[PDB]
A and B are shown apart, each in its own frame.
Chain A
């Protein structure tokens, strides 16, 4: 009898899924590649290592630029957070972590704060205003902390291996809004420019758009054949790109509620650790497990370049707000600023 009611609910779910698939197909009159055909390709633009940041003793699992397009932070499993001056390569701060296992780091837009987290299942907030000491420790995630991003100094959104994201009130130190409905580990998150929305990558091979204020999933994006390790918003906030273990990058549109484009190349089989757009959004940068970082044309779906500075897989990427510099980080313990 319980099965009979479950059979109904299954059949209804199937019907609804078919409707969405059919509604999305009705939406496609044309494709992104078709409409951009007259657009002159980027070509091949060669970049170079303009800076090499040394002093990390282990794998670098994450990094985040400052909003001033100068300072940046990095998280290594050596048990250290390091704030760098990218111009002079001077180490501004070295922050000892109570847990040497750290999978992410973030830099507050005000520049007053920095966050990090990992297998300790905690997002730790460090105050940068002599030396640096921790301000807040936000607990309650039962899974590992994969990613975190500041809305402002009082608000941060985190994602975890317990399949949930969260909105935190840092002042109270309490979780404000909990985001549920992912069936797998959430590897990454990205806020919309206006911080009205944010998207999440996960091990369920799906990306999900969440409402920050009302605390709900709006849309769900699929088509990836493996885990989504990275996610990033297109500058206008109407689109986002996803990196994955299926070796592919996928551009999704919010209004169209579907996949616009796949960025992948035969002979590229390795997983993708990180993604970032350029300032205009024309260029999509992706960190790979093959030690490289490939530069894709977002509109033309062609590779505009390649970056190999690293002897180990590239774990993370970043692009300055001014779009002047590209930062890579890796398991080879080194950071490289490209221009």
Chain B
């Protein structure tokens, strides 16, 4: 086999040392973004049939 086996181990170390945040915080942030721009989403928010280019 190849000496590249060492490189992977080193990459795994870089994979290993990182800042990891609890899911609930990451999950709340995604909710926060969705609700923030929810009114701006034309697929969620039924923009008036007058203004939309396809009618």
Known contacts A13-B8, A45-B43, A324-B42: A239-B30 contact under CB 8 Å: yes
Q: Which of B3-49 touch A at CB < 8 Å?
A: 5-6, 8-9, 11-16, 18-31, 33-34, 36-38, 40-44, 47
Not counting A34-B27, A278-B43, A283-B41, a sample of 15 additional A-B residue pairs whose C-beta atoms are within 8 angstroms of each other reads A23-B16, A24-B20, A27-B21, A28-B22, A35-B27, A70-B53, A236-B29, A255-B20, A256-B20, A279-B43, A280-B33, A281-B33, A282-B34, A299-B34, A339-B54
B: which residues have CB within 8 A of A? 1, 5-6, 8-9, 11-16, 18-31, 33-34, 36-38, 40-44, 47, 52-55
Known contacts A27-B20, A31-B27: A337-B54 contact under CB 8 Å: yes
Residue A174 is within 8 A (CB to CB) of chain B in the complex: no
Give Cα A45 to B41, complex, Å: 13
Q: Which of A246-260 touch B at CB < 8 Å?
A: 253, 255-258, 260
A339 to B27, Cβ gap below 8 A? no
A: which residues have CB within 8 A of B? 2, 6, 9-10, 12-13, 16-17, 19-20, 23-24, 26-32, 34-36, 39, 42, 45, 47, 50-51, 70, 86-87, 181, 216-220, 234-236, 238-239, 253, 255-258, 260, 278-283, 298-299, 322-326, 337, 339
A181 to B24, Cβ gap below 8 A? no
- Minimum CB–CB distance from B42 to chain A (whole Å) comes to 5
Give Cα A30 to B26, complex, Å: 10
- Minimum CB–CB distance from B5 to chain A (whole Å) comes to 5
* Closest residue on chain A to residue B49 by CB atoms: A339
A30 to B27, Cβ gap below 8 A? yes
Give Cα A235 to B20, complex, Å: 21
Q: What residues on B are CB-neighbors of A30 within 8 Å?
A: 23-24, 27
B34 to A280, Cβ gap below 8 A? yes
Q: Please provide the 4 A-B residue pairs with the shortest distance between their CB atoms, ordered closest to farther.
A: A50-B54, A280-B41, A16-B12, A280-B37
Q: What residues on B are CB-neighbors of A253 within 8 Å?
A: 23, 26-27, 30
Q: What residues on A are CB-neighbors of B16 within 8 Å?
A: 16, 19-20, 23
